[PDB]
């Protein structure tokens, strides 16, 4: 999907996160944020559209990605084990990572 | 499978390899060895039952198998190259990555 | 194959590349290149036979391959934009990880 599609599963998973009552909410939520984060890696952000691959801004934009989903699966073994509570403290910390690439980029 | 059930996998393996005649049976008890430790991985062990997934605890658990694993495929390719009494060496040397461990997590 | 195949290989599709007219075929040759680079990283070259997996050698051989394949990434997301001219002119930069490992190890 679109880099805009993407980020819509990001952002609306992010609340299903916030409000979840079980493990199995958060778990669902987690691995299809994982799934967009992926394939968001995968698109030039309009910002980025003159520059080649291998420039820092490109590998930094992918590198964006690799923490997301890295932290992602910090929530995702919390949820395994049915600690939702703290599955869901480790969700809300995605969001520095969020900001700080669309500080950058969006 | 769980963690007991993974270092029995392991443990039989490894003596499967200092009795085993050609590269076959050593690169087939590899292989066990290989799927145990790259499953082991996935689970918490008892000692850190309490631990975050992001723990230096958690971390340098999980990195044991990773040099595990890698000790493995050095093995591995030993006894794909037909050489048994090199690959049969290469893994005496996974011994020392066990009692690393178990040292600080059995 | 071995890997005298997927040299021949990497020499052909860079050829192909060479004298391309549209993105579509730069493509496809680089992702046969990358196909043949992945290949030829599991070969143990004639040069090397003796040479423990763990060498710096040995080490230093798959090394060049993850050169190239990255190199080849790089490439392959240009004719992806569709911008032939430039994932030509990368593909050329591709000869300099060519010559260095034929240099040690060829
Ligand atoms: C879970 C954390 C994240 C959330 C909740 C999130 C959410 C959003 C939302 C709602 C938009 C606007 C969608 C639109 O109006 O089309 C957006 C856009 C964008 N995001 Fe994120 N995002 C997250 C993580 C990231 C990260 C880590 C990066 C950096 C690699 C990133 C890069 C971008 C870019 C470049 C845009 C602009 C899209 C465009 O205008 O074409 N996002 N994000
Ligand atoms: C090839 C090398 C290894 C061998 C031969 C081996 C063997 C064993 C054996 C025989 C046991 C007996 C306990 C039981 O029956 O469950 C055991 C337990 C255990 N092993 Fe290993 N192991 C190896 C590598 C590792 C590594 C690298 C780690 C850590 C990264 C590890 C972590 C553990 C833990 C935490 C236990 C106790 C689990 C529990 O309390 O249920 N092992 N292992
Ligand atoms: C696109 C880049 C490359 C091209 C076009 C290329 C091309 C070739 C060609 C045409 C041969 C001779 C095949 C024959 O025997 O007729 C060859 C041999 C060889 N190349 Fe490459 N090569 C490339 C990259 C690499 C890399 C990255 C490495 C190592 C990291 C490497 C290592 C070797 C070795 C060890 C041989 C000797 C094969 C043998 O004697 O059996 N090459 N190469
Ligand atoms: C250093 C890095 O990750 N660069 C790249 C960054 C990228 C960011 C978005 C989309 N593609 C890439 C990309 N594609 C092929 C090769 C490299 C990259
Ligand atoms: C740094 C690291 O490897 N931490 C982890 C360590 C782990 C140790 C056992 C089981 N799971 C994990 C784990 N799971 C998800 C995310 C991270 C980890
Ligand atoms: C660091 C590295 O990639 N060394 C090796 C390099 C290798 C080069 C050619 C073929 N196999 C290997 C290999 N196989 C198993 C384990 C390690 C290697
Ligand atoms: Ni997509
Ligand atoms: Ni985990
Ligand atoms: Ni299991
Ligand atoms: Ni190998
Ligand atoms: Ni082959
Ligand atoms: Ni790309």
């Not at 998973?13 to 992926?38: C, F, G, P, S, Y």
């Amino acid at each position: 999907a679109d880099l805009e599609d993407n980020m819509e599963t990001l952002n609306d998973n992010l609340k299903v996160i916030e409000k979840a009552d079980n493990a199995a909410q958060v778990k669902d939520a987690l691995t299809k944020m994982r799934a967009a984060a992926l394939d968001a890696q995968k698109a030039t952000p309009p910002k980025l559209e003159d520059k080649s691959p291998d420039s820092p801004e490109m590998c930094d934009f992918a590198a964006g990605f690799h923490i997301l989903v890295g932290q992602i699966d910090d929530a995702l073994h919390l949820a395994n084990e049915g600690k939702v509570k703290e599955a869901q403290a480790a969700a809300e910390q995605l969001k520095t990572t969020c900001n700080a690439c669309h500080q950058k980029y969006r």
